[PDB]
Swiss-Prot record, chain A:
It comes from Severe acute respiratory syndrome coronavirus 2 (2019-nCoV). Changing residue 83 to H: In strain: A23.1. Binds to host ACE2. RBD also interacts with the N-linked glycan on 'Asn-90' of ACE2. Cleavage of S generates a polybasic C-terminal sequence on S1 that binds to host Neuropilin-1 (NRP1) and Neuropilin-2 (NRP2) receptors. Interacts with host integrin alpha-5/beta-1 (ITGA5:ITGB1) and with ACE2 in complex with integrin alpha-5/beta-1 (ITGA5:ITGB1). May interact via cytoplasmic c-terminus with M protein. May interact (via N-terminus) with host bilirubin and biliverdin, thereby preventing antibody binding to the SARS-CoV-2 spike NTD via an allosteric mechanism. Glycans are attached at residues 73, 86. The lineage of its organism: Viruses, Riboviria, Orthornavirae, Pisuviricota, Pisoniviricetes. Attaches the virion to the cell membrane by interacting with host receptor, initiating the infection. The major receptor is host ACE2. When S2/S2' has been cleaved, binding to the receptor triggers direct fusion at the cell membrane. When S2/S2' has not been cleaved, binding to the receptor results in internalization of the virus by endocytosis using host TFRC and GRM2 and leading to fusion of the virion membrane with the host endosomal membrane. Alternatively, may use NRP1/NRP2 and integrin as entry receptors. The chain holds residues 531 to 620 of 1273 of the full protein. This is Spike protein S1. Disulfide bonds join 8-60.
Length: 90, 94
């Protein structure tokens, strides 16, 4: 299925499955290799089988919603803080 | 790294409320008042006092009569400065 770049996608590569944000990446694999991995034994970076390229995997961002409010006494108005995102996914 | 790996599974690192630049403003203040105002800024409004006349008190605190500092000031200056220098290498080299 056509590959998705810079957009949250479920995926399967060569049977490897996960969900992340696939990007272009400059880390450099030796020929025979398949995965990359991080310190945590997550699957960090994968290589596209059909067109060899080094694709990062960053699972889609998430964070705690924080409702900032004065006392409900003074107002009903809230200002929401989405923690640790770029402002798009709103 | 530990930068996002943890952040994969729901292990989040929240930002400390006070940025490091702010911490460095406090430790500037505390250090700015200590130098100029003596110890009085902790008890109320800071009181400008000549630093060399501050150290006359801090000797009275330890029982050395202030006439030692007013006479040894130049010497005590160098011992202080040369002591500060080695603090760099104490950190720098180990
Ligand atoms: C986050 O999104 C804003 C636009 O809402 C943009 O100006 C900013 O550069 C982005 N920052 C990052 C981390 O990409």
């Amino acid at each position: 299925t056509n590959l998705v770049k810079n957009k949250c996608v479920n995926f399967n590569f060569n049977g490897l499955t996960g969900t992340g944000v696939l990007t272009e990446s400059n880390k450099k694999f030796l020929p025979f290799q398949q995965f990359g991995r991080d310190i945590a034994d997550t699957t960090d970076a994968v290589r596209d089988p059909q067109t060899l390229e080094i694709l990062d995997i960053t699972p889609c961002s998430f964070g705690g919603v924080s409702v900032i409010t004065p006392g409900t006494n003074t107002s009903n108005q809230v200002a929401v803080l989405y923690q640790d995102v770029n402002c798009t996914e709103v | 790294d530990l930068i996002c790996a943890q952040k994969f599974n729901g292990l989040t690192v929240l930002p400390p409320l006070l940025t490091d630049e702010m911490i460095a403003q406090y430790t500037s203040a505390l250090l700015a008042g200590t130098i100029t105002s003596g110890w009085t800024f902790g008890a109320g409004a800071a009181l400008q006092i000549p630093f060399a006349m501050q150290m006359a008190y801090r000797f009275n605190g330890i029982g050395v009569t202030q006439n030692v500092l007013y006479e040894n000031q130049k010497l005590i200056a160098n011992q202080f400065n040369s002591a500060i220098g080695k603090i760099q290498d104490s950190l720098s080299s180990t």
